[PDB]
Amino acid sequence: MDIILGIRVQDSVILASSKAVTRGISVLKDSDDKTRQLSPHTLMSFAGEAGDTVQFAEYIQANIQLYSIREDYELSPQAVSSFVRQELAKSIRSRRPYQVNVLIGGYDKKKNKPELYQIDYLGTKVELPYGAHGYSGFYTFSLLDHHYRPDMTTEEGLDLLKLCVQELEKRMPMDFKGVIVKIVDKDGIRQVDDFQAQ
Amino acid sequence: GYDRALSIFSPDGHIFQVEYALEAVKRGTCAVGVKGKNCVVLGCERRSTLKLQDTRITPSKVSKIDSHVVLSFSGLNADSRILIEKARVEAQSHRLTLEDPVTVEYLTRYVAGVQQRYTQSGGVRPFGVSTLIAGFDPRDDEPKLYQTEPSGIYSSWSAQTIGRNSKTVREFLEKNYDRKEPPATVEECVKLTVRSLLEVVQTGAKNIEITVVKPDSDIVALSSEEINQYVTQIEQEKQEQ
Amino acid sequence: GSRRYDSRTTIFSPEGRLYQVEYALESISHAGTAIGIMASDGIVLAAERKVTSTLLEQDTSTEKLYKLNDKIAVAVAGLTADAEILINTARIHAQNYLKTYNEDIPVEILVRRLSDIKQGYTQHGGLRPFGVSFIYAGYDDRYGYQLYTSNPSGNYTGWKAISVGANTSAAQTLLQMDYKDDMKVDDAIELALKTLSKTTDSSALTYDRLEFATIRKGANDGEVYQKIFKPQEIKDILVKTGIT
Amino acid sequence: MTDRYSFSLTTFSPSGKLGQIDYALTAVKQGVTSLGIKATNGVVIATEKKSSSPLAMSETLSKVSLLTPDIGAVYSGMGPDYRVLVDKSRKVAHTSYKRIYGEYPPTKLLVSEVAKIMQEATQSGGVRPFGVSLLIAGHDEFNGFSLYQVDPSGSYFPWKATAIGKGSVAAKTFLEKRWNDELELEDAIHIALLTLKESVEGEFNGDTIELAIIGDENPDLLGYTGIPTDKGPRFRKLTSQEINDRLEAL
Amino acid sequence: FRNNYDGDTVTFSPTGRLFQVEYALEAIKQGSVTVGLRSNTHAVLVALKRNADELSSYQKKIIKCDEHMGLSLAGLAPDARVLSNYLRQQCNYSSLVFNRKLAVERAGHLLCDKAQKNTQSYGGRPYGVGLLIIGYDKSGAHLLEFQPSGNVTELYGTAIGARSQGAKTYLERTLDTFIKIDGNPDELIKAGVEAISQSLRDESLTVDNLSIAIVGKDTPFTIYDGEAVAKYI
Amino acid sequence: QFNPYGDNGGTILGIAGEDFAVLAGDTRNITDYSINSRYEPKVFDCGDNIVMSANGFAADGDALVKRFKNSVKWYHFDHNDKKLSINSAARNIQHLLYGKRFFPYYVHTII
Amino acid sequence: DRGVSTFSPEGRLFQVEYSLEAIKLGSTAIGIATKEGVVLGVEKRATSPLLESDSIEKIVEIDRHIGCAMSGLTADARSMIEHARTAAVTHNLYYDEDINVESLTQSVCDLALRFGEGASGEERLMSRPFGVALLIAGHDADDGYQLFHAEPSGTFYRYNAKAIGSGSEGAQAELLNEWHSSLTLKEAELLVLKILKQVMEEKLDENNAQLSCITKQDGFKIYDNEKTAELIKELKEKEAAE
Amino acid sequence: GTGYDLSNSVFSPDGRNFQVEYAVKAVENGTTSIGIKCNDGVVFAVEKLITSKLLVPQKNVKIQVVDRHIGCVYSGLIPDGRHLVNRGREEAASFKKLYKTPIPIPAFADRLGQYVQAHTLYNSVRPFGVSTIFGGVDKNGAHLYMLEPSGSYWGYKGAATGKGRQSAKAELEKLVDHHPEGLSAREAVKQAAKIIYLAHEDNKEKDFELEISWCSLSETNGLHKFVKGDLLQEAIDFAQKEIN
Amino acid sequence: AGYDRHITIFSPEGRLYQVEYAFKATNQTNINSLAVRGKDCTVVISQKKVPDKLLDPTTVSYIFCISRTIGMVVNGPIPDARNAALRAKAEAAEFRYKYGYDMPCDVLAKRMANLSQIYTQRAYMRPLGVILTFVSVDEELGPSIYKTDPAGYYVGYKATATGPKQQEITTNLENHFKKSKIDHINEESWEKVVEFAITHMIDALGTEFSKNDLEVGVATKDKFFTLSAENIEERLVAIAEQD
């Protein structure tokens, strides 16, 4: 499948997501962004079923933005993820369930702490220091389990990722065409346009 | 199950329910809006029949339908909410499908349609509301100011007012707003606005709130002080004569 | 057909007013008075029970002060039966919000929801409006202590201190007189009692004809607490403030 | 066909009154008196069986009904409306409580339920309020014995003792003299029978009177034995005979 | 009197009348005139088209329901559109399902039953239009007169609309004559145009004012407007 | 289980001349190895100078034709006897067919 | 009260009649049909000098070969234009061709009587008749250029020229003389511009009046203020010239 | 007060339903018709006012058949009559479909009865402006019935309704006495053609066309059939001969 | 203001006029009826008044056979009475199907009264101007008489009467019971109970009947039936030899 990695360091959350988009025999795109910004300080990455993936993302996005405007306030990463879990958990027993896995990473401007939530298509939500979806974890978790420290600087975080991405490029069968990385901190969401050779 | 036709024509060709819906607007507090050359300003008056409120949490008179468009109104408050809501939802829906925020004209057109529909549907009475919608189209720098009413009709204005004593204040604006040279400053624009409100608010430092909307989702409301400062200088303009 | 008997509850008067709402408000003005006063460290809700008897049970009672949430409570003025219908839907909204976001419903959101339900019966359905007015007192981590008021028109507002029911006119003037922004819960509790006391239509103001509730944030904890004073606790605070 | 009556039949008047509710109450005033007294170990409700013809069998018509094995109700106003209310109540008690929690509902709740029903007939489309007032008396493990009154408005209040109907005013007064917070069940039955006599014009015996109590558990009225936790219903209807016995020492 | 019982169709007068229905009828009489007559081989419709200004067209009054059936209207144009349309379906249903051509006498029953419904229930309103249906089926030529009251009648000829009483007396006299114009269409038409003028009074039926339709033994219901009728003016 | 489809064979041909057009088709109707009829017209005249043939599963072919023909009729009813150009009939037929996109008319059709 | 679709003792529908009275209070709109095209003109009629006169839309395009003008309660025409546009497009989709001007009109008129509180016949949900009349103008290969007038009654007429609005009876009697079966497009534009000037409460100028036409070659176009102002001028000249 | 006759299902102070009564007026105002029950069948005859000479004779049929064995004739508002018969036809089919045996006359009567009585229950509908005479032959006998707008219906030996209802009734009462042992199908047909003729005197101003139908176990085999041609003339004459 | 008289809503006095007027309707037939209980049977008698000679007397009845065991007599217009009977039969047929045993008289009575009460509260449904008297020999209560009215009220009687001259029949029977001290006709055969009824019917109404002036229904263990002109005749004859 696709790559969905997330790591909560000291003062931020980092999301790495593969850029490839393959439809059977060919690789249609190598510059895809498997992420949406739900609020100025909350980001969501996603992977899964061909169509449901973006549709779900954009549906969740629209709702969070509507809440923001209605209340002139930003829901906490926790609230946002609880809302997303309920959405997934509802469609699991519906006629046609959304087959999407997500990673929600945001910075709680109220508690002044970064947060990382992992939710699978079933509606199983869990808060973690770092997480991945699909086969991604099978390779990276041992590295992260080893090198992870709660007080890592954003810089140490990116180095740890870079390490995971390398293990993924070595042992994993498919070419996911590298990743796009993004940082969520007290100052919002920004993309590290230099990971192709950092 | 309830469909009784409440809004119907009368012998002279009037739809009294819409007519009376308008009388409700006349009663609502006054609201005004004037467009500059690179901004639009919205002024409204706060009542004083009862005072001891908590302005922090009490609903304000100018609402954001989206980051780049605001909406103010005159008439029944409870009704305005229902419209504000549908507008905000339609605003998000539009971004979700057309992949671009709404243009002020469109958002206005939508709100007006809603109002109109309630004039010829059974079991419902018209909205006792009239509105001012202002903002800047996406990636545009030309200001937009629109106004809608119970009838369902809408149109744009260089400046306009709705609510009680809107006649008086409209008159002020008709002989004080030169289309040839519209307030070229965010400054002089807010001034012209306050000046008009002062014709009806009768001394109301806390009874007058202004909001300034500029290009690229730049909306902001002034605090009693900034306003009070405008009032203070405007009252001197008269006594220096 | 039926058109003949249809009162047309949702129409505009020639003066742009809503008949039923105006009348419902009139109805409310005969209801026991309820007061809400907000201090820097808490909110106080006090209401007067309209008409009583010697045999009326006052322990197993709670006709005007209802708990909506763990942090939100309301004081009612009007048809209790209607009030209960709205209260129950309100308690549901609160729980849905919690179940959806794992956070307590912000006071204003809950108040708005209820006001909209009321506003509905105003614009469609040909049913009579709910003859009820609420004073909401709650706390949330975004505005802390808040006090709100909603009436049959579906309109709502925020206050420092407010009253609903009968003699709101007199009561509001008294409140607007001895209220000060730096008040303290116990000052309010006292102010409240005084006000109800000077605007009652009864001989004296006794404990059995009252309801009292306070939302304080007990310094010894760090969280919020709702207290609906019991018959005894009301008798006490009634002697202390000096009314015996 | 089709109910075109989808609008309210009860609306607010300029004065602020709800016509139909007032009228419904007026109808209750014309009804035969009924009352309830709360003792410290039981509650008693009773009313007068006003027969419509000496050919009619007044047994085949109970004005005092059992809602649950620990809750009974009596009324004043319109017989039919009471009847259906009793049915709707007995059901709401199962569907909204027993079928969920596995035990009967506590008095205040069931009352709150009955009140809800009556309230709806005050705002729902095309209907008139119920023309009755009820006095419901029950006992639940965590509240003990209680007594409530429910009006056509849908409002309800708890009482130590009270009466409704024809001569409510007079009877309410009579109770305010004889009631105290130390009354034993038997005492209330006595007081009850007395307050009831002042209303009754004709024959005052165990055939023209209907009376029931909410006291101790009657395991002889359970129908089976084997479950220690099931001890019997606290609601018993006094027999024609049992009444007279207490009438002689009146 | 009347004032209190003409509120809607669901109400009966104390005398037993249905005003709303009667009022609907009045919209017919206020309508333009049209006539119908048939022989034993053909059936003809001649209608006088009315106009608003001298810059407005003359509202068509002849409608074809099928290859063997058609009608003329007197009153509310819309209601005729509704009815003709419903009738078009009934014919269509008959051809498709039973591969049978709908009996003119049966189209009448259908129209009657449909109209009747709008006179027994609340909310509705009687159809404000009269109709003359002509057609050639398995039992020869036919002509029907339809009333918003729900009464449909089979005749040899007739007319409805304003002044319709003229042509109706004329045809009542010319009976034995036209009823025998079998084999000669042009005759029935001239005979119809002669009855149609019996109710004129304002102007003379011009080219783009006369409207004529015909059906019969070997003639698929067809409409004639303008120069097509010039040879009959 | 019940199969809603069948194959009645037959073939149809359509050639367009510079100012004419032909639409031919045999007249045999079959079912497996049996012949149901040696003469069952498969090509039709629908009016407005249009010939059409829906070959494949008989029942479906007939229903389609019948529907199309009746479509022509209403085209006249609704647009003052205007003539249905062949290009319009084509487009119209597409909608008729695609209307059963998820329970197809088992026929190859030519006009 | 009384059925919202009741007959008067004269055989007329109250609501439909009263609907007509409302239209008599609307801005004037005029249409002239010629063998060179049809012309639609409307009186903007602002209600205050602050109102940006060009945001007044009383002449809309239904399709490239059909356009129309409105009069009376203009808000009520939104859904009519909507239903109209949709019908035109839908027709094109189903038939690969342009919807006949008359057809489009008949379709719009079909909504007209879909009102009441439960009239036994289908599902007519709309509490009252439309308080607006339309002048649908367009062209098709079968009947060339056409001008239609659609009313809230459901009936529609074809005119060679027609005016609706406050000054209709006046301007109509006017068109009676002026119209002949051989006017040119230019003649019509001026003629329309002329009659508007007579019935308008304001002094006609390129800002409170709007023109437009529909020609088989370029379809429906609305005349921009510059182009119109000129015909205003050009008109003033030919009027002073005798 | 008053106004007890403006809405359908309303009870007046005396217990009447004026709207139903007003419906009757609509009946008495229409043409007349009768039903004669012979010893093994029934005969229906009805007057047909010949407004003009344009009315094709033998074409505007008014008698109707329900199923194969039932005949219905009605006086008043023709459309309402047809409506009532359409319902009857569906009602009958439904019965035959479920029970196989064609619907018994008494059973069919009640079906119409309930359906008509229904239109006097709601004010959203108008009562039927017709009285109906119907009957036929079933498993055990022949039955004649007459149904009123009030939904009331009874079994009859002979019955009539409309303009000349009293005339007819008079003639019928005679037949019932001068033929105590029973009348035959053949007889009734003539007798009926007569009754119509006499009863036509209360509307003698216009020319009329006669119409008869019958259902005799022996003559029609139990099926409802119309009387035409020779057999019809034989009765027209039998009347024309006694009308003088 | 004045419409509180047309639909079933309370009047300022707390009355429901439409229900009151409904009661009025029940006397429109001007027919009287009474029911009495045997030792083990129940009898109902009702006047049969056939005005027109053109009517088939066997089709004129106000007594119905609800079920194999329940009989119901109606006082009021026939259309409403038939409406009520149909519903009552359907209700009795269904009850059996759903619960596995014949619907008791008092139960059907209650159910009908409940249905009647609904028309008392809902506005589009008008009350039925009829009074239903149900009778039978319940397998648990023995001879039974239950009556309901337009108000939705119902009760069981020892015996009862309905109609214009209702009060006379009542005080008549009323006296017979004060005298006999038992609450029922003490007889073994129903033929005698029927006679007792026809008697006290005459003694109260003050009129004599022929075999075509009455109508009699009898309820017994497992069956309810109506007597014929002749079965009745044989009854009139028996009371003829004693007076």
Swiss-Prot record, chain B:
Leftover remarks: Present with 16800 molecules/cell in log phase SD medium.
PROSITE patterns: PROTEASOME_ALPHA_1, PROTEASOME_ALPHA_2
Record keywords: Cytoplasm, Nucleus, Phosphoprotein, Proteasome
NCBIfam families xrefs: PRK03996.1
Compartments where located: Cytoplasm; Nucleus
A GO-annotated cellular component: mitochondrion
Family membership noted in the UniProt record: Belongs to the peptidase T1A family.
Primary localisation category: cytoplasm
Gene3D superfamilies: Glutamine Phosphoribosylpyrophosphate, subunit 1, domain 1
Keyword GTP-binding: no
Modified residues (Phosphothreonine): 58
Domain of life: Eukaryota
Quaternary organization: The 26S proteasome consists of a 20S proteasome core and two 19S regulatory subunits. The 20S proteasome core is composed of 28 subunits that are arranged in four stacked rings, resulting in a barrel-shaped structure. The two end rings are each formed by seven alpha subunits, and the two central rings are each formed by seven beta subunits. The catalytic chamber with the active sites is on the inside of the barrel. Interacts with CIC1.
UniProt-recorded name of the protein: Proteasome subunit alpha type-4
Organism from which the protein derives: Saccharomyces cerevisiae (strain ATCC 204508 / S288c) (Baker's yeast)
GO BP term (any one): proteasomal ubiquitin-independent protein catabolic process
Curated annotation (Swiss-Prot), chain C:
Biological process terms in GO annotation: proteasomal ubiquitin-independent protein catabolic process; proteasome core complex assembly; proteasome-mediated ubiquitin-dependent protein catabolic process
Keywords per UniProt: Cytoplasm, Isopeptide bond, Nucleus, Proteasome, Ubl conjugation
Keyword Cytoplasm among UniProt keywords: yes
GO CC, alphabetical: cytosol; nucleus; proteasome complex; proteasome core complex, alpha-subunit complex; proteasome storage granule
Localization of this protein: Cytoplasm; Nucleus
Record cross-link Glycyl lysine isopeptide (Lys-Gly) (interchain with G-Cter in ubiquitin), residues: 99, 198, 230
Signal peptide: none
PROSITE patterns to which the protein is assigned, alphabetical: PROTEASOME_ALPHA_1, PROTEASOME_ALPHA_2
Subcellular location, principal: cytoplasm
Family: Belongs to the peptidase T1A family.
Subunit structure: The 26S proteasome consists of a 20S proteasome core and two 19S regulatory subunits. The 20S proteasome core is composed of 28 subunits that are arranged in four stacked rings, resulting in a barrel-shaped structure. The two end rings are each formed by seven alpha subunits, and the two central rings are each formed by seven beta subunits. The catalytic chamber with the active sites is on the inside of the barrel.
Note: Present with 17100 molecules/cell in log phase SD medium.
Record's protein name: Proteasome subunit alpha type-3
UniProt lineage: Eukaryota, Fungi, Dikarya, Ascomycota, Saccharomycotina
Gene: PRE9
From Swiss-Prot, chain D:
GO CC annotations on file: nucleus; proteasome complex; proteasome core complex, alpha-subunit complex; proteasome storage granule
Presence of the UniProt keyword Ubl conjugation in the record: yes
Subcellular compartments: Cytoplasm; Nucleus
Residues joined by cross-link Glycyl lysine isopeptide (Lys-Gly) (interchain with G-Cter in ubiquitin): 108
Subunit structure: The 26S proteasome consists of a 20S proteasome core and two 19S regulatory subunits. The 20S proteasome core is composed of 28 subunits that are arranged in four stacked rings, resulting in a barrel-shaped structure. The two end rings are each formed by seven alpha subunits, and the two central rings are each formed by seven beta subunits. The catalytic chamber with the active sites is on the inside of the barrel.
Role played: The proteasome degrades poly-ubiquitinated proteins in the cytoplasm and in the nucleus. It is essential for the regulated turnover of proteins and for the removal of misfolded proteins. The proteasome is a multicatalytic proteinase complex that is characterized by its ability to cleave peptides with Arg, Phe, Tyr, Leu, and Glu adjacent to the leaving group at neutral or slightly basic pH. It has an ATP-dependent proteolytic activity.
Additional free-text comment from the UniProt record: Present with 7060 molecules/cell in log phase SD medium.
Name of the protein in its database record: Proteasome subunit alpha type-2
Organism: Saccharomyces cerevisiae (strain ATCC 204508 / S288c) (Baker's yeast)
Gene name of this polypeptide: PRE8
Swiss-Prot record, chain F:
Subcellular compartments: Cytoplasm; Nucleus
Self-association and partners: The 26S proteasome consists of a 20S proteasome core and two 19S regulatory subunits. The 20S proteasome core is composed of 28 subunits that are arranged in four stacked rings, resulting in a barrel-shaped structure. The two end rings are each formed by seven alpha subunits, and the two central rings are each formed by seven beta subunits. The catalytic chamber with the active sites is on the inside of the barrel.
Free-text function comment from the UniProt entry: Non-catalytic component of the proteasome which degrades poly-ubiquitinated proteins in the cytoplasm and in the nucleus. It is essential for the regulated turnover of proteins and for the removal of misfolded proteins. The proteasome is a multicatalytic proteinase complex that is characterized by its ability to cleave peptides with Arg, Phe, Tyr, Leu, and Glu adjacent to the leaving group at neutral or slightly basic pH. It has an ATP-dependent proteolytic activity.
Family: Belongs to the peptidase T1B family.
Official protein name in the record: Proteasome subunit beta type-6
Organism: Saccharomyces cerevisiae (strain ATCC 204508 / S288c) (Baker's yeast)
Shown part of the complete sequence: 20 to 130 of 241
